[PDB]
Each structure stands twice: as C-alpha cells, then as structure tokens.
C-alpha cells in the first residue's frame, strides 16, 4: 500500500459513498413508477387528486384557499367558452339585454381575476339561464368545454359567497395549471408507488419519454365521452381518434416493452347520459349493437382500443372507471395494484426463463 | 413578403463566400490515423442511466448525473468518489461544474436549475439556489462564472440567470422547438445553442440578442460544442450526422457521418487542439473523428448501452464517456 495517509482517508470516504449509493439505489427499486398518460381532458389530474384523497394526506383548508382562485378562473373560462361558442355556432340570444352581460364577460381577464363579485355574478347567472345559452350547453358537443360546467353554474350562488370555500368535489373538478413532471408517491399495502404525470409539459414527448424506460407500468386514461364530439371550433377531428392515435404511439415505443399497460376507460357516466341522446353508430360505422344501451358502447370502445396492440407479446389490463366519485377510484386503485403485481410476476418469470 | 426576401438575400450571400470547402483545403495534411485509447479508469457506482457529466477545470475532478437521482463528483485519477449529491428531482438531464470548482449545477424535467455549493463550512453540499421560471424541461446548463449561469430549456428559449438573486438577467427567445444543447465560448462572451428545429443559434450573452443562425441538420440538434479557439463549433443531430459551423464564415464546413452509422449522436466534444472530435452515438459506441478530415473514426467501444455523455479535460489529457449502462470510462 503506497498510499499516503490522506489518500487512504480519501479511499475510505469513497467507500462510504459507495455504501450510501448502494443503499439508496436499492431503495429506488422497491418504488414502482407508474407513468400516467392519456389525452387532455381525459381525467388524469382528477385521478391523482382522487388517490391523493384516498392514499395521501388529502387537501387541507389551506390547499382549498389556494384552489379557490383556480376555481374562479375555471368558472370564468367555462362561461367565456360557452359565450364564444354561441357566436361561432350561429345561434342568437333569446334575451337581448343579457347580450350586454355577455359582453361584460367577453373582456374579462381570466388569468388575472381573483375576485368574483357583482355585476359579474349576476351577469353569469343571467347568461346561463338564457334559453339560447342552455341550447348551447346542450349542443356543447361541437366545442371544447369543461365537463364540470353544469356543476359550477348550478352552484354559482354557493361559490359567489364572500365566505365561499371549495369543497372536495370542487377541488376534484378544477384545473391546476402547473407545468412540469409531477411525481406523487403512494403506500399500497407496504408497497411504495409513484404516479409520474406528464402532459402539463407542452414540449416534444420524444425528447424525454426514454427517461421513462424504467417504469413498471403505463396508466393510459381514455375518456368514454370522447365520441360524439367532432369539434367545430377547429378542424373536424374526433377525440376518440386522437386517443387511439396516442395509445398506438405509446404502445409502440420500444421503451415501454418492459412495462405493462393499464387502460382506464373514464367518464362512463357521461357516456350513460349521452347514449340517451346520441348513439355510437353515427360516428363509428364498425359498431353494431343496441342504440340506447351503455354496456354495449363500453365494450365496443374497449374492444376497439385493445386491438390497437400490434403484437401478442403485451397484455393490456383494462378497467371501466369514473374518476370523479370515490369508492370507484378505490376499485381502480385496487385494480392498479393487482395489475402491477401481476406485471412484476411476469417480468420475474421471463427473467427466470419460465414465462 | 419582406421576410422571404431577407431569407433570400441571406442565402444568396450565404453561397457567395462558399468558394471552397474545408475538405478541399485539408487534402495536404497528414492524418493522425488510428488512435487506440484504453480505459485507464472505469468509474463505477451509478445505478441508472447517466445523462450528463462535466469535467473540472483542474482536469481531475468530474461531476456526473444519473436517473438514480444523484450527482457524483469523482477524483478521476484515483477512481475516488469525492462527493455524492442526492437530487430532489430524479429526472435530471444535465449537470455542470463551476469553473472555480465551488459550485455544481443540475436540472431536468422539473423545469428548475438547482445550483449546489461545494465549498461549505458545514462540510456537506447544500442547494445554493433553485432557478425557476422555465416552462419546459432543462436540457443543458453552463456556468459563466460563480455568479451567472445559462440554462437551455424546452421552452424554445434560453435564459441567463444571475444566481445570487435567482432572477433571469436575460432571456434568449427565438427558437421554434425544444432547445437541447448549449456551449460556452472560451471567453464566455457568447454561447451557441441547438434546438429541435434542426437549427442552432449563436447568441450574445451580454447584449442578449441572437447574432447568428445555422441551418443544415435534418433532425434535432441534441449535441453542440465549441472548437477550442471559439471561432467554430460542431453539432450532433439525430441524422447520424455531426457538422462543423464556423461563426466567421457563417456556413457549414465539414460533415461527420458514415454509411453504416444510422443512429443519432448524443454528445460531441473536441480535443485540446481541436484535432479530434469525439462523438457519442446511439449504437453504443463513441467515435473519434479527425476533425480536419472527417475520416478517422477511432472507436471507444467499451459501453454496452447508448453513450449519453462525454468530455475532454482542459489539458486534453483524457476523455470521460458515460453511457446508459451506468458506467463512466476514462480513456487516455
């Protein structure tokens, strides 16, 4: 040993660091990373909110105080979107006076407003109960509009209170416009999970998706209400088709061949109320089944989505979820844990040259 | 219509000064030929993909970042680990080592550039600063000095930050796609930045205005570095092509590609005299081109996964290559 005293001490420090790295890096393999994917307005932020409510610490009243401004931006954004869709669908107002109220909303600075008082409250209320505005809400099929618009404009009076505090449901149904990867860890029966949510990042996916080569599974949220909306606010494009394209792109990535796919079909309730008015056959010709049934629609959508799998070397766990009400998202979480355990099983069997 | 005319006049003026090519004027020089480099040291300890490394200015210390969520500072001469920094975000794509050695940087999918002080009286490495304000992931960062750092993001924008206040001193907008790499001039009065629009830009740090724009790649420019005089810089794209751009000529000079190379470059770096351009590739290799002729292709074939980062010391005495198989090799 030609080393001096100080270099022997340096070797000692390097070995200490070796041990610390080994410890931390074996902790970093007990935690399973689930990459949460899907299209916009599919129900994945509400998904993380729900499991935070039922597996994290929940939202304290300080968080609700932080969320209230976002709630008011949501109410203004939905009202403005309906107002704009009125002037693009070529439908006039039944009441002329409320038109002026509509103007009062058209110039609002959505990103800047933090107070919600009169006459804005009265203007919004007088707009919403217009027969023309109700017709526009009924025909919201042809334009982008948050699904929680009915829920907020039928509790306007509650949210217009000077002492209004958002409830758990209000927290669920509000956009938090944060950009960047969000990691959220979990304890499912002494198993550490972590949902990695992207999609708040508007950058190109190909440049940071290989970073998720080491994910246990991909939780792909498709919305069952995406049919019967070929938005006319832009070029005529179905939303189911966008979801299918994204699903194919995800399940053809070489990064994700080691990771299973859990497909969650969401907004099933809204499918139930859409079936009573609109049927699949008008937009998907390959469909052939009952017109006013919902289970047939659900299984058609699932069969259509699971057959995008190019190969027989990847199984797709699937679920019918409604990521707004609890005690159904608990079922979704149990299904996630079970599917991830099965994925780990199959990976170990493949490594042991058994499966 | 005036924009098209300005692009038209630039192109016709662009072709005027391209009387010859770098290949024609280099037919009278002796090739270095095969260069056999050896793994003098294999630095082990990273447990996941290595995404960036940066040499120290003493040519001996070395910081490297992995998706294991950790930076490691290595004494490259003795394979000793000098520091181990656990990161708050494990989705790190870049790291930097300060010229004075007091500081390290990192950043990634959190859109935040974290600066860590290395010379503390408390004996550990503390997070000196967290620079936030980018709306996309950070792909590269480079200390101008202990006080200022430039960060490139997927915002299509770069940002020169004053660290001691944490605010963007200047912003560099103008790219169309995500900015992926970044290189500082030797005097650090300029930098060069390539983005996912196949074009790079030469940016003025002081005045904050884009001086120059270089086009010619066919895909994302995900690797960029300066020739040691600061008058030239070599890009690496997904086209399986590296390319040399000289700032004075305002053109492209020589390409670095081959018929059997189909995968994109992850990293580029020059040799101390600029006679060697080492280029890390997605075929698990790390080529070594004679930067003056483009026909050397020495191979540092020691990695079993994609070579994601490489670098040459400030005395050109070695070259470190880190790859996706979590190993750093020091070739001399």
């Amino acid at each position: 040993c030609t080393l001096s005293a100080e270099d022997k001490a340096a070797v000692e420090r390097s070995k200490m660091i070796d041990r610390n790295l080994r410890e931390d890096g074996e902790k970093a393999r007990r935690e399973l990373k689930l990459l949460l994917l899907g299209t916009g307005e599919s129900g994945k932020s509400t998904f993380i909110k729900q499991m935070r409510i039922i597996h994290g610490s929940g939202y304290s009243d300080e968080d609700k105080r932080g969320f209230t401004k976002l709630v008011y931006q949501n109410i203004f954004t939905a009202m403005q979107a309906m107002i704009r869709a009125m002037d693009t669908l070529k439908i006039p107002y039944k009441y002329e006076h409320n038109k002026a109220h509509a103007q009062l909303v058209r110039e609002v600075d959505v990103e800047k407003v933090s107070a919600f008082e009169n006459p804005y409250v009265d203007a919004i209320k007088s707009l919403w109960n217009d027969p023309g505005i109700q017709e526009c809400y009924d025909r919201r099929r042809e334009y982008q509009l948050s699904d929680s618009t009915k829920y907020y404009l039928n509790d306007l009076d509650r949210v217009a209170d000077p002492a209004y505090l958002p409830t758990q449901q209000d927290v669920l149904r509000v956009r938090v416009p944060t950009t960047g990867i969000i990691e959220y860890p979990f304890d499912l029966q002494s198993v550490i999970f972590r949902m990695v949510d992207v999609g708040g990042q508007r950058s190109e996916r190909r440049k940071w998706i290989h970073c998720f080569e080491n994910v246990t599974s991909i939780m792909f949220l498709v919305a069952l209400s995406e049919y019967d909306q070929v938005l006319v606010e832009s070029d005529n494009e179905n939303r189911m088709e966008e979801s299918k394209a994204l699903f194919r792109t995800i399940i053809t990535y070489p990064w994700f061949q080691n990771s299973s796919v859990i497909l969650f079909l969401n907004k099933k309730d809204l499918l139930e109320e859409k079936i009573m008015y609109s049927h699949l056959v008008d937009y998907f010709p390959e469909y052939d089944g009952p017109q006013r049934d919902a289970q047939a629609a659900r299984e058609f959508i699932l069969k259509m989505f699971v057959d995008l799998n190019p190969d027989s070397d990847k199984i797709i766990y699937s679920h019918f979820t409604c990521a707004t009400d609890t005690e159904n998202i608990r079922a979704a979480a149990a299904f996630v844990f079970a599917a991830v355990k099965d994925t780990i099983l199959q990976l170990n069997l493949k490594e042991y040259n058994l499966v | 219509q005036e924009a098209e005319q300005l692009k038209n006049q630039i192109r016709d003026a662009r072709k005027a000064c391209a009387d010859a090519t770098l290949s024609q004027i280099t037919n009278n020089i002796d090739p270095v030929g095969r260069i056999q480099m050896r793994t003098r040291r294999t630095l082990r300890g990273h447990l996941a993909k290595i995404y960036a490394m940066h040499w120290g200015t003493d040519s001996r210390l070395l910081v490297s970042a992995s998706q294991d969520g950790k930076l490691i500072i290595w004494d490259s001469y003795t394979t000793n680990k000098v520091h181990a920094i656990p990161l708050r975000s494990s989705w790190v794509m870049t790291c930097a080592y300060a010229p004075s050695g007091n500081y390290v940087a990192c950043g990634g999918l959190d859109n935040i550039c974290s600066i860590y002080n290395l010379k503390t009286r408390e004996g550990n490495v503390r997070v000196s600063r967290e620079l936030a304000g980018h709306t996309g992931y950070l792909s590269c960062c480079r200390f101008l000095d202990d006080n200022q750092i430039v960060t490139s993001s997927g915002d299509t924008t770069c940002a020169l930050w004053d660290i001691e206040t944490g605010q963007q001193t200047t912003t560099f907008t103008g790219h169309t796609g995500d900015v992926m790499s970044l290189s500082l001039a030797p005097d650090t009065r300029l930098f060069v930045s390539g983005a996912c629009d196949a074009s790079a830009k030469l940016w003025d740090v002081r005045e904050g205005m884009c001086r120059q724009t270089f086009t010619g790649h066919e895909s994302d420019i995900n690797a960029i570095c300066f020739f040691p005089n600061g008058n030239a810089f070599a890009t690496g794209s997904d086209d399986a092509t590296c390319r040399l751009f000289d700032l004075r000529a305002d053109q492209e000079l020589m390409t670095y590609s081959h018929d059997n190379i189909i995968c994109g470059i992850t990293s580029v770096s020059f040799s101390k005299s600029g006679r060697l351009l080492l280029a890390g590739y997605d075929d698990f290799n790390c080529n070594v081109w004679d930067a003056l002729k483009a026909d050397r292709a020495g191979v540092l074939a020691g990695h079993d996964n994609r070579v994601s980062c490489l670098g040459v010391t400030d005395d050109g005495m070695a070259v470190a290559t880190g790859s996706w198989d979590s190993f750093l090799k020091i070739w001399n």
Partner: single-chain antibody
Framework: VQLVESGGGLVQPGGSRKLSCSAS????????MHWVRQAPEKGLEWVAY????????YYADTVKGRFTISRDDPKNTLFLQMTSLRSEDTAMYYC??????????????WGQGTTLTVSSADIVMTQATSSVPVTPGESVSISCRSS???????????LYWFLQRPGQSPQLLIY???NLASGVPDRFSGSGSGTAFTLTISRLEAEDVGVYYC?????????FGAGTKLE
C-alpha cells in the same frame, strides 16, 4: 461550524478521564476527528485520529492502548477515553475537525480544547528558533526542518503551518506546504524544498503574533515542531 470540548480538569495520579467534543453547525458524521495535545511549556502533540465512518483509529506510541477514541454521529459527540494518567499527561487537549477528499483542508477548524492536569522512525519536525524579534509592518520568515521528505510520490507535501495566538486555540494557516486556509489573510505563504520549509508573512500586522507550528501529516504519528514564537 463549532466544536466544544468538555471533560478536562484535575485528575488524581493514575485515574481516568472521558473528554467529549460536541459538534454543532456542520456534518460531523462526514468529518474525521483528531485529538491534539499541547503541554503548558511546549509545542503541540498529536493524540489520536478517528475516521469518517469509524473505520480506522490511530494513536501515538506514547498513549496507544492506554487511550481510546470513539464517536457518536447521531448526537455528534466525539470521545477520548484516557487511562492511567502519568505526570506527562498534563496538557491542553484540542479536538480538530479534518476532512479528506481531493481538495479538502484538514485541520481547518479546531475546537477550544480543555486542560487536563495530572497531579524514532517517526518523522522529526524541528523548529529553527524559539522566538523571532520583529517590528510591526515588517516582513517576517520562520523556518522548520523534517527528517524525511514530506513530498509524497503522489505530488503532495503534507506539511502544515498553524498559528496559535496568545490565549487562543490553534488555527490552520497553511495546508500541504503551500495552500492558504479559508479565512487566513493573503499575507501568508509557505514554501521550500523537501526537508526545508519556510513560512513567510508580508505586511506583518498586529494580532499576527503568537507561535507558529510546523506539523507533518505524511504518516501517522503526526509530528509537531516546537513552533517559533513571533512576538
């Protein structure tokens, strides 16, 4: 960044004493610790060393087996257990913080020590003279010698120059024969050849008086010289 020693006092002939050191304000679990003597009318003298991680322990050939160094990282308390105290054990005992990576400045921060009053192959470091008369504002230079060459074949030279001001604990000035410790004015420098070392002070100010010490760290034990008293 603070080290407090405790446990010193008057001990009966023989006997035993446990001296503690509480570290506060730094990462004491990432630091090696030394115990360093100093007689009431003599220079310093190294006692012991414990490593970062408790891996290795070193004693001097005048206390070995009769001492015991130890540490407790959760409570950041270093210990020297001391047994069978002969007359030659009456000294101030200082706890020295010392880290070792590439670039570290060992012996940078010392504690305040604590008095304890009891009722040849080693490198020999040797001062030139006991004192040097000087004048404020002048330039001063002391010298020191080593039996071996402290230039290790790795390029380092493990000479250390320390300052102990009257009524104060020591303070690293020069680490590894040339490098100025943090907080030391740039007025100091150290240079020489193997087995011949000189410490130079330019623009000699007040409170720069004291005793300057030349220690070596090339091997254990760590050997001091008498140290020149700049007065």
């Amino acid at each position: 960044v603070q080290l407090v020693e405790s446990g010193g006092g008057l001990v009966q002939p023989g006997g035993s004493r446990k001296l503690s050191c509480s570290a506060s304000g730094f990462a004491f679990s990432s630091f090696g610790m030394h115990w360093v003597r100093q007689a009431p009318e003599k220079g310093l003298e190294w006692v012991a060393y414990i490593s970062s991680g408790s891996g290795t322990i070193y004693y001097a050939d005048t206390v070995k087996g009769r001492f015991t160094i130890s540490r407790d990282d959760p409570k950041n308390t270093l210990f020297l257990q001391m047994t069978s105290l002969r007359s030659e054990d009456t000294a101030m005992y200082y706890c020295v913080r010392s880290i070792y990576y590439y670039g570290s400045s060992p012996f940078d921060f010392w504690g305040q020590g604590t008095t304890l009053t009891v009722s040849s192959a080693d490198i020999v470091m040797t001062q030139a003279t006991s004192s040097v008369p000087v004048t404020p504002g002048e330039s001063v230079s002391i010298s020191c010698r080593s039996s071996k060459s402290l230039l290790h074949s790795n390029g380092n030279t493990y000479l250390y120059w320390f300052l102990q001001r009257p009524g104060q604990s020591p303070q690293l000035l020069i680490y590894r024969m040339s490098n100025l410790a943090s907080g030391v004015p740039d007025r100091f420098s150290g240079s020489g050849s193997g087995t011949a070392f000189t410490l130079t002070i330019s623009r000699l100010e007040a409170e720069d008086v004291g005793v300057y010490y030349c220690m070596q760290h090339l091997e254990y034990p760590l050997t001091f010289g008498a140290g020149t008293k700049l007065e």
